[PDB]
Amino acid sequence: YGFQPTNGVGYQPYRVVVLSFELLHAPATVCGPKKSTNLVKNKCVNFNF
Amino acid sequence: GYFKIYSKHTPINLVRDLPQGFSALEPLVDLPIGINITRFQTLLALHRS
Amino acid sequence: FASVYAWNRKRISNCVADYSVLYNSASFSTFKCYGVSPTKLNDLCFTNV
Amino acid sequence: YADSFVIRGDEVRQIAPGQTGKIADYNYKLPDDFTGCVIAWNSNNLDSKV
Numbered sequence A: 001y002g003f004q005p006t007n008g009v010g011y012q013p014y015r016v017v018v019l020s021f022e023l024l025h026a027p028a029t030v031c032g033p034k035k036s037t038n039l040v041k042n043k044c045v046n047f048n049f
Numbered sequence B: 001g002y003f004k005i006y007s008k009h010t011p012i013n014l015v016r017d018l019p020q021g022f023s024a025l026e027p028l029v030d031l032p033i034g035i036n037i038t039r040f041q042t043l044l045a046l047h048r049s
Numbered sequence C: 001f002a003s004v005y006a007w008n009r010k011r012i013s014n015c016v017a018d019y020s021v022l023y024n025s026a027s028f029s030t031f032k033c034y035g036v037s038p039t040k041l042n043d044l045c046f047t048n049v
Numbered sequence D: 001y002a003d004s005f006v007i008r009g010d011e012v013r014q015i016a017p018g019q020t021g022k023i024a025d026y027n028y029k030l031p032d033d034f035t036g037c038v039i040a041w042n043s044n045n046l047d048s049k050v
């Protein structure tokens, strides 16, 4: 490539990064912060274990 | 943008009028500040007693 | 940086200015200079810039 | 997976699932069924030289 500071747009370098994920092929271990609460019992609730 | 001040001091003995002599005025100070000055005032040292 | 309709002005004097650091840097996208060729700018002396 | 590189400004459109150019086919070809994301930005102030 040729990269001079004075070069016009499109002739200037761009940094590119791509992220690729999987769709349930293994026990998931990469996800954001989930604030775990306490554990209730003997009640009709929905859980996210 | 230059404020030029020239000054001179002289001991005198004449009573009232300006002396009828000749004396040059040496330069005193140059200031590199530009203003739109159009009027001026005077300071007096009154006896607060 | 101030807006274009209220462009900011600074008066620089009584200093030793090196233009090579400004000349060689590649951060500046656009350079255009009128009064004197840039290579000669380090050779002159001015006042009230 | 994270894949990083640097390209020219005009060629950013070539990176598109379901496209064939020069970078797209000869340098880096992403499968069209892409389960991910793409990020890009300018680095002229970092990757340019007089």
Ligand SMILES: *[C@@H]1O[C@H](CO)[C@@H](O[C@@H]2O[C@H](CO)[C@@H](O)[C@H](O)[C@H]2NC(C)=O)[C@H](O)[C@H]1NC(C)=O
Pocket (backbone or CB within 6 Å): B036, B038
């Ligand atoms: C310097 O100050 C004088 C007075 O403060 C300015 O003169 C005024 O200019 C305006 C605009 O034309 C007139 O409407 C006023 O009537 C003028 N007043 C007087 C007393 O003349 C003058 O423009 C100022 N100069 C600069 C460079 O700022």
